[PDB]
């Protein structure tokens, strides 16, 4: 019963291992194993539940263990292991074959098979940790191992894609440990974690690997947002070390999502508005990306309110996420209607929900935007309006208070009007007829560059699938 | 944080206190290069000072800053200025990079100088800072019985 | 290890040969468009 269970999953694990084993030996095929490793994460997660944990026990016995002797015992000690044929050397799948990692040449140390075996061994260990949700000592014990090993081992172009997915598990398992319980040893692990990301990023710069460097950047930018220090992130994004070539579909929208949050407190909404829009188009529409689309669309609606312009409220309805978008509808309604008491009572009840996404701090500053939008609505209606007519509609304090607030709207060129103190009315200075200026040419010059930018993208992509088929023989 | 306040203290008095301040910075030179980027004009301005004896440790700090800034050629100048804190025998990706850049800069200069004089390697025509690492690394490959790097670069 | 330093010079040769054709093809396609409009 239990004997046939261990041989079934181990044969499928070697079958998938031999596919990427022979491809990395000749030249560089690494593009092909990268596609296989994408599905390997999903196929292994479903397979870990079946046949219990015994699929990874005989896999270490098959190959040679450089560091992994005590790692499997320590990983299986917390679950109160039940020992069945636990003596090492029970299952031998090698039997002296070239693709089987021939033993005599391996035991005599005349050849080194540890490079591809050990780096792949750490991948299967991190998968069971996230599947079984093993925390506390098991998280810190594996961190003391992989990091010193990556410093001694020098990865080639194909080998840099192995640990690229391991850095995500180190940061993911660390954040779940801090939020679960607060202990004195929690931040001691984060200090070394923050210093380790900067040391390995220095080496990956010369490797020119797209997935390796881009995976760390999105993990480093998230750490800066938790501490709330832009000075570390400001110079970090100015170097432009983020590879734009191949992020696949995972890192497309993750990079632009951080720039929208950083520039939100920079008081520049021109560039931040484009980053949040590009994050929506680059993010997949599937169910696994719904967690990202939930937080991203909530940030886009908050940026528009900070710009002074009322966005489209139809997104709060036709979308299927409106259950979580209900608190944000009353915020825009209070800013549009200009009611002072409605905005104060709206943020009071939903303050608990705004604490999770940390958007309540931006909602406090929406108190000013209620007046910013209210002035824009009343100004467009009446070109010449009396000074006391504004205080009657918005129920303001006095005439000296509104005189200061209207002067704040034309600061950046929003309203573009003038205040006449002696005449007693505010007159709009916008005569339209802007076509006589150079403004139409300013937009058309970018459309030509944007059209040729899409041309330059299509300019050079054809031959990539044609390299394999034209070089190989065809019927 | 950490050494961030220590970067602006270089304008104060008591240069003996600056000795202990630069030692704590030597740990963070490979960690956070952002705060140092604003203090780079102040670090280089102290190099030519005759009363500043810490240029050995000062050049070690800027060696890993301009390198992380994205300028590989600039980090070679600071590494060859002190000729002390730079460890040629230390095994790291940072040390192996300067060696590759210093030898590459030596080939570009010695390429057009071979026509004028063939004795340039016996004279000061080429910067002795470039010949310091170049001469030692080729002799190191000879002791390792490697003719690929020794004869390949010489050609 | 002999092919490592031998192909090092070939890397610059393959780059220049592709650049020379790329520079000459711009002047060649100009005469191609003139013959099409002439017919």
């Amino acid at each position: 019963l239990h004997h046939s269970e261990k041989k079934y999953a181990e044969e499928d694990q070697v079958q998938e291992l031999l596919k990427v084993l022979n491809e990395i030996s000749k030249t560089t095929l690494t593009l092909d194993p990268r596609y296989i490793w994408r599905s390997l994460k999903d196929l292994s997660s479903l397979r870990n539940q079946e046949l219990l944990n015994a699929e990874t026990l005989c896999f270490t016995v098959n190959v040679l263990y450089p560091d992994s002797s005590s790692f499997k015992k320590n990983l299986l000690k917390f679950i109160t292991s039940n020992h069945k044929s636990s003596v090492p050397g029970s299952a031998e799948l090698r039997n002296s074959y070239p693709a089987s990692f021939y033993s005599v040449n391996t035991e005599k140390k005349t050849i080194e098979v540890t490079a591809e075996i050990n780096c792949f061994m750490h991948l299967l260990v991190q998968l069971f940790l996230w599947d079984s949700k093993e925390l506390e000592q098991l998280v810190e014990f594996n961190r003391k191992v992989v990091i010193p090993n990556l410093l001694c081992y020098y990865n080639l172009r194909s080998l840099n894609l192995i640990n690229a997915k391991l850095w995500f598990y180190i940061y993911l398992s660390h954040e779940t440990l801090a939020r679960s319980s607060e202990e004195i040893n929690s931040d001691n692990q984060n200090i070394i974690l923050r210093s380790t990301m900067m040391k390995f990023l220095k080496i990956a710069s010369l490797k020119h690997d797209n997935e390796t460097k881009a995976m760390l950047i999105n993990l480093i930018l998230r750490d800066f947002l938790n501490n709330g220090e832009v000075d570390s992130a400001s110079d970090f994004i100015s170097k432009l070390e983020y590879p734009h070539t191949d992020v696949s579909s995972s890192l497309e929208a993750r990079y632009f999502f951080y720039l929208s949050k950083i520039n939100a407190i920079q008081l520049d909404y021109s560039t931040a508005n484009e980053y949040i829009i590009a994050a929506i188009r680059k993010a997949p529409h599937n169910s696994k990306s719904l967690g990202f689309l939930q937080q991203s669309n909530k940030l886009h609606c908050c940026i528009q309110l900070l710009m002074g312009d009322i966005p489209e409220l139809s997104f709060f309805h036709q979308s299927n996420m409106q259950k979580s978008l209900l608190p944000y509808y009353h915020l825009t309604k209070a800013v549009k209607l200009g009611d002072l008491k409605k905005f104060t009572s709206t943020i009071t009840k939903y303050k608990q929900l705004l604490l999770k996404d940390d958007t309540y701090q931006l909602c406090v500053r929406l108190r000013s935007n209620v007046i910013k939008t209210g002035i824009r609505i009343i100004s467009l209606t009446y070109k010449k309006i009396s000074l006391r007519d504004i205080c009657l509609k918005l129920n303001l304090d006095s005439e000296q208070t509104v005189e200061y607030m209207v002067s704040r709207a034309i600061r950046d060129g929003v309203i573009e009007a003038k205040i006449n103190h002696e005449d007693g009315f505010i007159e709009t200075t916008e005569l339209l007829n802007i076509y006589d200026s150079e403004d139409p040419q300013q937009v058309f010059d970018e459309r030509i560059k944007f059209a040729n930018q899409l041309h330059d993208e299509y300019l050079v992509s054809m031959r990539y699938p044609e390299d394999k088929k034209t070089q190989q023989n065809e019927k | 944080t950490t050494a961030a306040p220590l970067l602006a203290l270089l304008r104060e008095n008591q240069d003996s206190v600056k000795t202990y301040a630069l030692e704590s910075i030597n740990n963070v030179v490979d960690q956070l290069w952002s705060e140092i980027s604003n203090e780079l004009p102040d670090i280089e301005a102290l190099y030519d000072d005759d009363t500043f004896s810490d240029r050995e440790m000062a050049a070690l700090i800027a060696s890993k800053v301009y390198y992380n800034l994205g300028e590989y050629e600039s980090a070679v100048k600071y590494a060859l200025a002190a000729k002390d804190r730079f460890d040629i025998d230390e095994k790291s990706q940072f040390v192996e990079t300067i060696v590759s850049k210093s030898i590459e800069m030596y080939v570009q200069e010695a390429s057009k100088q071979y026509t004028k004089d063939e004795q340039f390697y016996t004279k000061d025509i080429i910067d002795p800072k470039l010949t310091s690492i170049f001469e030692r690394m080729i002799e190191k490959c000879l002791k390792a019985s490697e003719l690929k790097l020794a004869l390949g670069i010489a050609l | 290890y002999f092919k490592l330093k031998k192909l090092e010079k070939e890397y610059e040769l393959l780059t220049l040969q592709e650049d020379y054709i790329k520079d000459e093809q711009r002047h060649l396609k100009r005469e191609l468009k003139r013959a099409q409009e002439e017919v």
């Binding site: 050079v460 | 590759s100 | 490592l4 192909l7 393959l14 396609k29």
Partner: peptide, 28 residues
């Protein structure tokens, strides 16, 4: 081979750029 491996990407980059511009010339 630090410089050889680093400059190897320029070989595949310029090769894929020139071949895809030959199809336009071969079409003309």
């Amino acid at each position: 081979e630090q410089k050889i491996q680093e400059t190897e990407l320029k070989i595949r980059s310029k090769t894929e750029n020139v071949r895809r511009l030959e199809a336009q010339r071969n079409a003309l």
